[PDB]
């Protein structure tokens, strides 16, 4: 009984950590709460402890696309952007050639590139030097009076 | 259902050996057989062999750290190398739903086992039924198995794993004999590296929600 | 080194206590369900060990990875992590430098038939004498190496952005430079010192080959786990020479020297001693397995925190500032 | 009691949505469950 009781206290501390990390917050560490990507957790009482129900986001139907580390303005090479929480992908939307779009990191849905999903960075040798179609963040404003 | 260890077979003493200070009752002409021995008042059961001489000759009995006889100096002028007769371990592979069974023989090479095991002895009165199929013993990486059919199938998981990658697949829908399958590794989605300033991105186009209970 | 398992042992209680002698079988038959309890406890412990292995390696596997071609790594020489066409070179070296007895698992019964002279209390030939048995591990060497190699091929592409549900197949060098940029080294410095950084990484990784020695604490821990397994087997193999207040330790000797009224008493002394030994062994195995389960959970956490991501908490992965972690298989973890 | 334990668990369930997007330990925002779920989804890489 002493051995079992000593084990149950460590288990209770683990349950405390799980309540504080998975139920009262969304956890960014994989595998701790559940499988996949953690979103929300619930807890109920069980005969001799707690019963956690972790809801996770499980992706399926993966496709492969081509992406760039970043985009730089060919005219002004020191003006570059990188995606924020997402990727720069090559579109095929029956439109202009070598168009670049933005997609979220966890679901494929190309969108226009804008200042809301990009951030300015220093140029790198792996960035793409694009000459035409210049997404709005890369548009060097030259509209004076 | 599971794989249960059971009582093992024991080698049967073939002959006897006696010694002191007819002709067939001698250490020679019995090397390799499990025999009883009574040498100068020291008695037991074991297997004799020809080993290179070791220890002190005038003290014919050679022991080890744990008071076990491991050598002997015979009157014939040869040093005989002594062991204990060894058992054959046995386990039973049992499926409850189809009520099917196979026999796994520890780590033996199927040369030492037979359909009757008349050379051995154990308390258990009889062997498992092993009906009409009764083909030769199958040799597996985990040992010799009786009542298994080589299937060359692959599974993603099994309820009774034999060992090292091996599973016994019951003939679930008279159920047939169990099959010897292997666990196959589930390869992750392979994405190749480009040789340019681009890179390949693997990204989902569908999703679902899943509950993990704990 | 993080241990995840213990050696799986079953004993044949009937043959361990009586070793074949029919007189002892009747004497033990009125002791009822002691041997049955020992067998059931050992069976449950082995089932839990298998479940722990399956859970750990199901949490270790990656959903997406990149094929490990030769030269994987580029300017960073990590060829000692690449599999030799299936274990890695460093994994092979680690398994070679550890003093571990080779179990049979196949035609190992016939290996001990010849056996030569005994090799310093061979605990692998003692199972067919004492009456226990060492079960093979659940997975092959090749399958474990497949899991570990598939883990190695996803390290670079873990994803800088919310990287759980997507995989970017970037070179190893790019991932290293992104990891270095995030700890306070600027892009200009990384671009100037590219070759120097690669050389400094290669110097550190190369000193590993000449590292498995007495000063290595992790290697000593591996050897300690192996030695604990060996001691557990040796205690079983050693109590068969004990004479628990009897005239001899061999049942066949007291049988051919006394009369049944005395035979029963002596054989019962031996039976009780051996049953107590087996009960102690079962309790210690249960304790060791319960400890190994917690250690396996720790290994799962370390794989998810240090190998599949760059950790921001100091001390958890290693000393200094953590950048990248690799993992290989070890004797028991 | 069973009722006291259920009270603790139910009170825990009612604060799940409002754990607070911003430094959420000392403040409580009584937002609907759907809003919280969509904010959690947006943070794992799904665009608005």
From Swiss-Prot, chain B:
Glycans are attached at residues 23, 50, 150, 195, 206. It comes from the Viruses. Attaches the virion to the cell membrane by interacting with host receptor, initiating the infection. Interacts with host DPP4 to mediate virla entry. This is Spike protein S1. It comes from Middle East respiratory syndrome-related coronavirus (isolate United Kingdom/H123990006/2012) (MERS-CoV). The gene is S.
From Swiss-Prot, chain C:
It comes from the Viruses. The record marks 87-88 as: Cleavage. Residues 107-129 are annotated as: Fusion peptide 2. Residues 194-244 are annotated as: Heptad repeat 1. Glycans are attached at residue 77. Residues 223-267 form a coiled coil. Disulfide bonds join 112-125. Residues 88-109 are annotated as: Fusion peptide 1. Mediates fusion of the virion and cellular membranes by acting as a class I viral fusion protein. Under the current model, the protein has at least three conformational states: pre-fusion native state, pre-hairpin intermediate state, and post-fusion hairpin state. During viral and target cell membrane fusion, the coiled coil regions (heptad repeats) assume a trimer-of-hairpins structure, positioning the fusion peptide in close proximity to the C-terminal region of the ectodomain. This is Spike protein S2. It comes from Middle East respiratory syndrome-related coronavirus (isolate United Kingdom/H123990006/2012) (MERS-CoV). The lineage of its organism: Viruses, Riboviria, Orthornavirae, Pisuviricota, Pisoniviricetes. The gene is S.
């Amino acid at each position: 009984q002493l051995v079992r009781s000593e084990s149950a206290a460590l288990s209770a501390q683990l349950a405390k950590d799980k309540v504080n990390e998975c139920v009262k917050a969304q956890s960014k560490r994989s595998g701790f709460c559940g499988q996949g990507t953690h979103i929300v957790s619930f807890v109920v009482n069980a005969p001799n402890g707690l019963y956690f129900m972790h809801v996770g986001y499980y992706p399926s139907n993966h496709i492969e696309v081509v992406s760039a580390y970043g985009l730089c303005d060919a005219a002004n090479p020191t003006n570059c952007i990188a995606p924020v929480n997402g990727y720069f992908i090559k579109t095929n939307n029956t439109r202009i050639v070598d168009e670049w779009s933005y997609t979220g990191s966890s679901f494929y849905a190309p969108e226009p590139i804008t200042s809301l999903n990009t951030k300015y960075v220093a140029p790198q040798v792996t960035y793409q030097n694009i000459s035409t179609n210049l997404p709005p963040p890369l548009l060097g404003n030259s509209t004076g009076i | 259902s599971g794989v249960y260890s059971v009582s093992s077979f024991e080698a049967k003493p073939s002959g006897s050996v006696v010694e002191q200070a007819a002709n067939d009752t001698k250490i020679a002409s019995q090397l390799g057989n499990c025999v009883e021995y009574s040498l100068y008042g020291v008695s037991g059961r074991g297997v004799f062999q020809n080993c290179t001489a070791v220890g002190v000759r005038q003290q014919r009995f050679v022991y080890d750290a744990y008071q076990n006889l491991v050598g002997y100096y015979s009157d014939d002028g040869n040093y005989y190398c002594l062991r204990a007769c060894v058992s054959v371990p046995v386990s039973v592979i049992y499926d409850k739903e189809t009520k099917t069974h196979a026999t796994l023989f520890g780590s033996v090479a199927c040369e030492h086992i037979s359909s009757t095991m008349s050379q051995y002895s154990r308390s258990t009165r009889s062997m498992l039924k092993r009906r009409d199929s009764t083909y030769g013993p199958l040799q597996t990486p985990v040992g010799c198995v009786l009542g298994l059919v080589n299937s060359s199938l692959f599974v993603e998981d099994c309820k009774l794993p034999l060992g090292q990658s091996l599973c016994a697949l019951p003939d679930t829908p008279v159920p047939g004999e169990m099959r010897l399958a292997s666990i196959a590794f589930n390869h992750p989605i392979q994405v190749d590296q480009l040789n340019s300033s681009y890179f390949k991105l693997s990204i989902p186009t569908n999703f679902s929600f899943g509950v993990t209970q704990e | 080194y993080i241990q995840t398992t213990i050696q799986k042992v079953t004993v044949d209680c009937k043959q361990y206590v009586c070793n074949g002698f029919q007189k002892c079988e009747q004497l033990l038959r009125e002791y009822g369900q002691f041997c049955s309890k020992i067998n059931q406890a050992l069976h449950g412990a082995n089932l839990r060990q298998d479940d722990s292995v399956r859970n750990l390696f199901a949490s270790v596997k990656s959903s997406q990875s990149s094929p490990i071609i030769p030269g994987f790594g580029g300017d960073f020489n990590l060829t000692l992590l690449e599999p030799v066409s299936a274990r890695s070179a460093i994994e092979d070296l680690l398994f070679d430098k550890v003093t571990i007895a080779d179990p049979g698992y196949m035609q190992g019964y016939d290996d001990c038939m010849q056996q030569g002279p005994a090799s310093a209390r061979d605990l692998i030939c003692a199972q067919y004498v004492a009456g226990y048995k060492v079960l093979p591990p659940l997975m092959d060497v090749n399958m474990e190496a497949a899991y570990t190699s598939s883990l190695l091929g996803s390290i670079a592409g873990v994803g800088w952005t919310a990287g759980l549900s997507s995989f970017a197949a970037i070179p190893f060098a790019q991932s290293i430079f992104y990891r270095l940029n995030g700890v306070g080294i600027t892009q200009q410095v990384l671009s100037e010192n590219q070759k120097l950084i690669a050389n400094k990484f290669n110097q550190a990784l190369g000193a590993m080959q000449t590292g498995f020695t007495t000063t290595n604490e992790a290697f000593q821990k591996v050897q300690d786990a192996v030695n604990n397994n060996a001691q557990a087997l040796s205690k079983l193999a050693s109590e068969l020479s004990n004479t628990f207040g009897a005239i001899s330790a061999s049942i066949g000797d007291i049988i051919q020297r006394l009369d049944p009224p005395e035979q029963d008493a002596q054989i019962d002394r031996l039976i009780n001693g051996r049953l107590t030994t087996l009960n102690a062994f079962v309790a210690q195995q249960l304790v060791r397995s319960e400890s190994a389960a917690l250690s396996a959970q720790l290994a799962k956490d370390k794989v998810n925190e240090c190998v599949k991501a760059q950790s921001k908490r100091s001390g958890f992965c290693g000393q200094g500032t953590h950048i990248v972690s690799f993992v290989v298989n070890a004797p028991n973890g």
